[model samples]
Target chain A: MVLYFIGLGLYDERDITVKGLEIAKKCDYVFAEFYTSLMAGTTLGRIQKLIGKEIRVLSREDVELNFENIVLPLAKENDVAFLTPGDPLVATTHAELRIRAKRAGVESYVIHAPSIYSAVGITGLHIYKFGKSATVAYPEGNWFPTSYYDVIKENAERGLHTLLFLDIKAEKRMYMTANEAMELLLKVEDMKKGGVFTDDTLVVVLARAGSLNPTIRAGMVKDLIREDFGDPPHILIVPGKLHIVEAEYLVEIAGAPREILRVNV
Target chain B: MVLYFIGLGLYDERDITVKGLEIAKKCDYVFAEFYTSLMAGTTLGRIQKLIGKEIRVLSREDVELNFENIVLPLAKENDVAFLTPGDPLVATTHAELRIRAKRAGVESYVIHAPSIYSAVGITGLHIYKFGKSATVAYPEGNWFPTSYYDVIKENAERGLHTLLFLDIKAEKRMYMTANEAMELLLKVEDMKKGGVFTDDTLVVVLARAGSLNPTIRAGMVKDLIREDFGDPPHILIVPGKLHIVEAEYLVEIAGAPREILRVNV
Candidate 1:
């Protein structure tokens, strides 16, 4: 008996690999942790229907409350699974679980899959230029966590791209849109005096990635917030220094208005 | 006319998405960059056969030297694909290309796929724990460049896991093995004076990931050097402060011998 931790990859239910599918079938119980990230295309009901199995959903609170005592022990007794949206171990919390499993002598296996960290390159952004990525949450009644702002500033200071993941509350269908994220950054600026991602900052927005029709747009912060990005699970990119080529991709690939960018300068 | 920079994911021909497959077929020309990293199980021939298209291979020289003239101009006139193994933009080189394309006023698209960075989480290593990853190149003659060595040491000082991508010269099929990498690191240590990854330091090795028979092992640098990790595209992880759980996963999940670990201390 083993605890198989599976990454369902990005976008849909079909993204689960053959190995992950088999493990889900063989396991006595399967649980999903979706708080870290959201699955773009597939719904919980749809995934449950397709797999032909009941998946016990674990909320952030559920795992924080019961993972060690109930989930860990149960996994030791039977073949259990902890399915993450992307790769299982990217989340620091999952690393904690794998550690607990090891101490208990419960064997575990990982079923690999695609993740967003690897997907940014699809936007023609240099993967190495990205520094300490963050999830942008909505302002809580005039309050926003500006630590992510500092992170962006630090990254930009070194001419690095900042990959900002828009926060999601899946069940509520409440996702922080790119526009709201930009606005929040500006608000943070108003409060903190000055930092990266100000009014004139060049930015890129990618919406509903992994889908057939993904919308990508790059522009100044104010300009981008006005455009309709279409759907949820959007990524807001705060580019540091645009090499001539990256600027081209913004205009050509992502449909950034050619007139807006100052290429030569 | 657009250039689609696609990533073929890892280890096999089947790893590419149906969407990526379509883009590859519709494109007029297919170009790939293979200097940064290579797939574990799949080869250029395998990708060509799987996609059912003749792929024009580009070396580091071709991409860096002829970026503005060849790749960009061709992409402007017709729909072309500059595909890369794993993730296209994992290397800063791809971003440089995209920016160059923008400067040339060429249209481009990125058809996203998985890359090695996504594998970090799948390997049960903490995602945020990774800081500033670097590629370990083969030292020339007797000179070992400690540039990457410093980066890894810095991450370790912050208690972050350093994901060192073993270098690959796919054109020549002369890849750097993890064992040889540790040996080289040891050499750098003797010259550089102070750094981590000593005889007692913990290291995790993953070979041929995304394959049916993947090997995962963890041990000290000295012990891992004695053990030969077969094949190319292997990843070496040097962990900093092993949170009790991380130490256990290294022992249980990775088949790391407990005797060599400092978890008890």
Candidate 2:
């Protein structure tokens, strides 16, 4: 018996590679886990339709706790697959499942899929030039995590890009908008007064990545919080240090104001 | 006129996304930049034929020094493309080209492609858990860069992933294998003698990402440096802090020996 772990790349239903799609079709039973992140850019129903299979949707509890009942019984008899919102192995949750299957002596395979971090490569940003990455969750009662701020500061001190993953509660119809995230960052700026991310700090906002109209805009942090970037699954990048080329590219390609580039702000 | 920036991904011609290939097909002129990194996994002529386009290969001198004479004129009048071997913009050189294009008022679009960094996502390591990244460049005449060690130390202190882009010179045929990187790290471990990386510090190695036969291995740094991970475009990740979940996942998904896991290793 085999347990196939598949990653569904960022964006929509079509992002699955030929290899991943092939596994999805051949697997005896397929399930997808979305709690770690949301792929609202494409819904579960759309994925099912596109793959031509009826894939069961697993919740955090279903896969995390009830793996034996849900995953093993299937893997014990035939090839079973657990798909993730992005490349399957990005989060530890999926890895846990793979281990359990191995303990049961089930053969496993991980079909490569795309992930959001790929943007580092796509944007022409040096992968090694990125600093610590963090997920911006909703401020727990007006108090956001200062650790995230420090991470960005560390990246800035080193002249790297900080990739921020906005949090989401898939079942609740809630998402942390880029605007709200900016507001929290602005507050962090005010509290620390670190002069790192200020009203004039250059911020890059990407909304609805993997979709046809993915938006890439660059502007001051304050302006970004005010602008409606449109749609869900937005990512914020706070560049710590900019080379002349990155500054120029952001200005022209990402709608960054020409004046704020490598000059002031 | 449209300027397209395409990434060749980490390995081979097929690593280019369908969208990226489509963009390449309509390009009136194509240019590929080969320095700062090499397309070790495939040749220039092979990739050009795969995408059904004629590519004008550019050297570091051509891209960095002669941007005006070498890149701008072609980009201005045609639907031009400047392709990078691995996720187009991972190097500072490409950013420099974008800056040049902006100055000439040429419009550009980036076709997102897979890259080496996505391995963090693929190996079930948390992308957000990584800290400042560093490259293990060639040591000049027995003088190793202690600065790289400092970067790793800082990331470890923060309980983050120190993602080391392995030292590889694509065109020159110079490749710094994982054993060499680990040896350099061991030198730091000896100097600092802080148990930062012990005979037991866990490391994850990913080689040939976005390739049909991509390899992922996890084990102690001491054990890992001994294993020969095949081919070019390799990346090494040293996890600073391990959550229990991460330990479990590594053991499960990466074929990590239980004895070397942070939980047991």
Candidate 3:
């Protein structure tokens, strides 16, 4: 008897690795959480149909608070599967859940999948050059989260690119767009008076990664702040000093301004 | 007629995404290179059997020098798939290869897969806290690379973790184990006197990542440098500052010393 943490990958049901799908198919029970990130290209019905199993959807609270009580009991007697978008452990809270499984005497294993963490490579940025990542969160009430802004600042100082994960409110069906994230950064910059994110600051936006035709665009913040990148699940990149080849890719593939080769490269 | 850059994912044949597998099976010709990284858990014969395609294994030279001539020509009229261990574009050179495809008037698409980049999350380190990555190379006669040491130093100063990819010689079948990587870092420390890596330095070792029972152990470098971590393709982590939960995970799940709860947490 065991518990498996399976990743559903990026966009569609087909994004699940063969091993993950095969294991999930044989599990007596399947549970999933979509609050962390949503699969923009596929639906729950599609995933259920493909896996041929009933996937019991859970909320952030359900998985975070009661994973032990609700999931471990079943795993003690049968093979159980828990699914999450992208890699299961990329979320720190999920990594903590594994400890809970251990405490409950449940053996757990992770099935890896394609996450935006690695899918950012689709933007033609060197993955090795990316520094600490941050999430552009929604400022609610009086609580403003500007830690993500400082992450870009630190990475940029080291000439490392920054990957900004836009916030998602799955229950509210609210997904943050790249434009909104850019605007938030600019607002924070105005308050801090730090020239971190200005109109001329270069940025890259990747929309619908893991899809056949993901939109990859790179240019000055002024130009991209209002640019239409299509659909949800957008990710923003604040590239540091670009390599010559990286600049060429942004220009030729992502359609960045030609001047960036001289300025950012 | 198309060029498909598909990732075989980490560790094994079954780790490939369903989307990658289906596309590879339908391709007229499939090519693969393992010089960058290898799936230590599976054989070439097993991968070929699963995809029903005869994969032409290419050397690093064949890919770097003759990719356009050998692969682009076939991609112009027939569907061709280029497979790599993890996501194809994680290697900067592979990202640049797309430029060659564009120059040759061949369109290409990248099929994403599980990469050690994201798979590192399995180590219970907060994925967001990882800074710029570097490769630990085997020091050659008269020439030694120590840039990886500086990367760790810079990352640690900012309280960010560093992911160190160990070098591999696929043709020679020489894979750098975690022990070798640790020893090399110690040698660099002796020369540079950077205090970057020392005997008592806290480190994490992940071996055969994508396999169900991967070896994940964390401890002082002195205790771990000579310890057996099993098979090839081992990655080392020099964590800077650990969160309480991160410490708990290392202790409970990875068998890290309980003293880490106070010292590193």
Q: Kindly list the per-residue Cα lDDT of model 1 for residues B1-265, writing each as its tens digit.
A: 7778777766776656445776788888888877777676777887888777899987778888987776777777888888877656676467656666767888656665556686765455666556567778887786667787887776676565677888776677788888888988888888787756588778888887766456778887777788877887888888766666666666766777775445544
lDDT winner: 3
TM-score of 2: 0.84
DockQ of each: 0.36, 0.42, 0.87
i-RMS of candidate 2: 2.9
Q: Write model 2 residue lDDT over B141-220, tens digit each, in one string.
A: 97767677778887887677888877766567787777778888887888888677777888888776666556778888
Name model 2 segments beyond 4 Å from true. Answer: A22-29, A39-55, A71-81, A120-126, A139-147, A153-161, A187-200, A211-213, A257-265, B26-50, B54-57, B65-78, B141-144, B187-201, B211-214, B252-265
lDDT of 2 at B82: 78
RMSD of each: 4.8, 3.7, 1.0
- Candidate 3 regions exceeding 4 Å error are B263-265
Candidate 3 docking band: high
lDDT of 2 at B115: 56
Q: How does each model score on lDDT? A: 0.74, 0.73, 0.93
Query: How well does each candidate superpose onto the true structure, as a TM-score?
Result: 0.79, 0.84, 0.99
lDDT of 2 by residue, A133-234 (tens): 887877678765777888788778767789988878778868888888888888888899887778878888887766546788888876777898888878
**Residue A190 in candidate 1, Cα distance off native in Å:** 2.8
Give residue B107's error in model 2 in angstroms: 2.2
- The candidate that wins on DockQ is 3
Which pairs of residues clash in candidate 3, taking residues 3 or more apart in a chain or in different chains?
none
Worst 10 residues of 1 chain A by lDDT: A256-265
lDDT of 3 by residue, A1-265 (tens): 9999999999999999999999999999999999888999999999999999999999899988899888889999999999999988998798999999999999999999998999999778898899999999999999999999999998999999999999998899988999999999999999997789999999999999998899999999999899999999899999999999999888878988998989998
What does candidate 1 score on TM? 0.79
